Scaffold this motif. Structure first.
Motif, PDB file in Angstrom:
ATOM      1  N   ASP C  82       0.835  -1.199   0.000  1.00 32.46           N
ATOM      2  CA  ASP C  82       0.000   0.000   0.000  1.00 32.46           C
ATOM      3  C   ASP C  82       0.875   1.257   0.000  1.00 32.46           C
ATOM      4  OD1 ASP C  82      -2.463  -1.301  -0.047  1.00 32.46           O
ATOM      5  OD2 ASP C  82      -2.749  -1.219   2.154  1.00 32.46           O
ATOM      6  N   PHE C  83       1.954   1.273   0.810  1.00 34.65           N
ATOM      7  CA  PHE C  83       2.876   2.421   0.859  1.00 34.65           C
ATOM      8  C   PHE C  83       3.532   2.652  -0.507  1.00 34.65           C
ATOM      9  CE2 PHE C  83       7.375   3.704   1.138  1.00 34.65           C
ATOM     10  CZ  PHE C  83       7.217   5.018   1.529  1.00 34.65           C
ATOM     11  N   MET C  84       3.958   1.577  -1.166  1.00 37.41           N
ATOM     12  CA  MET C  84       4.598   1.684  -2.487  1.00 37.41           C
ATOM     13  C   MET C  84       3.732   2.442  -3.467  1.00 37.41           C
ATOM     14  SD  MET C  84       6.279  -1.986  -3.212  1.00 37.41           S
ATOM     15  CE  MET C  84       7.175  -2.924  -1.938  1.00 37.41           C
ATOM     16  N   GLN C 107      14.298  -4.165   1.526  1.00 30.36           N
ATOM     17  CA  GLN C 107      15.292  -3.106   1.290  1.00 30.36           C
ATOM     18  C   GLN C 107      14.602  -1.786   0.910  1.00 30.36           C
ATOM     19  OE1 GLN C 107      18.369  -4.601  -1.383  1.00 30.36           O
ATOM     20  NE2 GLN C 107      18.009  -6.646  -0.621  1.00 30.36           N
ATOM     21  N   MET C 108      13.750  -1.292   1.824  1.00 30.47           N
ATOM     22  CA  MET C 108      13.028  -0.020   1.690  1.00 30.47           C
ATOM     23  C   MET C 108      13.565   0.834   2.821  1.00 30.47           C
ATOM     24  SD  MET C 108       9.291  -1.693   0.911  1.00 30.47           S
ATOM     25  CE  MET C 108       8.454  -0.121   0.556  1.00 30.47           C
ATOM     26  N   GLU C 109      14.734   1.438   2.563  1.00 27.74           N
ATOM     27  CA  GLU C 109      15.540   2.204   3.525  1.00 27.74           C
ATOM     28  C   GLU C 109      14.807   3.304   4.279  1.00 27.74           C
ATOM     29  N   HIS C 110      13.945   4.094   3.613  1.00 29.15           N
ATOM     30  CA  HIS C 110      13.232   5.178   4.301  1.00 29.15           C
ATOM     31  C   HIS C 110      12.195   4.654   5.289  1.00 29.15           C
ATOM     32  CE1 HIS C 110      15.324   8.164   2.025  1.00 29.15           C
ATOM     33  NE2 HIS C 110      14.884   7.692   0.863  1.00 29.15           N
ATOM     34  N   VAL C 111      11.521   3.533   4.951  1.00 34.12           N
ATOM     35  CA  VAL C 111      10.558   2.898   5.863  1.00 34.12           C
ATOM     36  C   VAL C 111      11.312   2.351   7.091  1.00 34.12           C
ATOM     37  CG1 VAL C 111       8.849   1.069   6.219  1.00 34.12           C
ATOM     38  CG2 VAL C 111       8.808   2.423   4.106  1.00 34.12           C
ATOM     39  N   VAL C 112      12.453   1.663   6.867  1.00 32.22           N
ATOM     40  CA  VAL C 112      13.284   1.134   7.971  1.00 32.22           C
ATOM     41  C   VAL C 112      13.681   2.262   8.940  1.00 32.22           C
ATOM     42  CG1 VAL C 112      15.407  -0.125   8.614  1.00 32.22           C
ATOM     43  CG2 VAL C 112      14.091  -0.819   6.590  1.00 32.22           C
TER      44      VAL C 112
HETATM   45 CL   LIG Z   1      11.281   3.358   1.360  1.00 32.64          CL
END
Ligand SMILES: [Cl-]
Ligand SMILES: CSc1ncc(Cl)c(Nc2ccc3c(c2)CC(=O)N3)n1
Ligand SMILES: CSc1ncc(Cl)c(Nc2ccc3c(c2)CC(=O)N3)n1
Ligand SMILES: [Cl-]
Ligand SMILES: [Cl-]
Ligand SMILES: [Cl-]
Lengths: 4, 123, 123, 4
Positions: C82-84, C107-112
């Motif tokens: 949903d975020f994507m 590997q979704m760096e900003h979410v991490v």
């Molecule tokens: Cl991200």
């Protein structure tokens, strides 16, 4: 990141 | 109660343009007066009312080649394809008429609006 | 000397999400502990380092089904998918650990980064 | 539209  | 990442949509589009520049997962060729442009059907649909109608058609959705009307200028198309993948429009005195005509045909309402405004300012 | 349309990237992503909701031109099924999620390979690649690596692989690029690691929680994946497509992350006390673990794997760096910050605030 |  923000409160939309 | 969601949080929102401001730069996400821009970052997605930037990555879609990187895929286009490396010809990764492009699934259609757009032919404009013998010039060929590779692109992603989903991006074309997301930006253009014309491509949206074409690729939601049960027969045309399966075509790997789409031929545009022979009146369409390849440079005008190229400028609009770049805009689709970047949000940047290279609008110049020498191309504004070809860009507006191509945007009207492609059904890209916001591009048509700015072309009309820039033309009105010059008269 | 380009002009830029501020809302273009957001409008593209909104249209890509409308295509997803109507299952138009989706070309992959992501399987997560028997739950199935349809999506566009290009959008997955644009948002995730893991999907970028998978779909640039000369063999995996042609797969219509991708099975994720059995440790991946389907709800965590659903929130990230949903975020994507929207830039909105439904981060809650009850899902933050599953969302962070899934974002690390995808590997979704900003979410991490935001999960690490929200977890640090609660300790 | 803006000047980027
Ligand atoms: Cl991200
Ligand atoms: C209308 S629902 C919808 N759903 C999904 C997509 Cl991919 C889509 N695209 C599209 C349709 C019309 C127009 C544009 C894009 C740009 C423009 O000026 N007009 N529309
Ligand atoms: C690095 S060049 C590139 N070119 C095209 C694409 Cl589709 C792409 N995606 C991608 C790669 C890595 C990561 C993400 C997306 C999100 C994240 O946190 N890490 N990258
Ligand atoms: Cl064909
Ligand atoms: Cl437009
Ligand atoms: Cl398969």
């Amino acid at each position: 990141w923000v409160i939309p | 109660s969601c949080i929102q990442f401001t730069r996400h949509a821009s970052d997605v589009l930037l990555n879609l343009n990187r895929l286009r520049s490396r010809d990764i997962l492009t699934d259609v060729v757009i032919v404009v007066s013998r010039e060929q442009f590779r692109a992603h059907k989903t991006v074309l649909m997301a930006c253009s009312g014309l491509f949206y109608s074409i690729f939601t058609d049960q027969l045309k959705c399966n075509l790997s080649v789409i031929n545009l009307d022979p009146e369409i200028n390849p440079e005008g198309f190229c400028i609009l394809l770049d805009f689709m993948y970047t949000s940047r429009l290279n609008l110049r005195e020498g191309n504004i008429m070809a860009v507006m005509a191509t945007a009207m045909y492609l059904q890209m309402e916001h591009v048509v609006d700015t072309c009309r405004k820039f033309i009105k300012a010059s008269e």
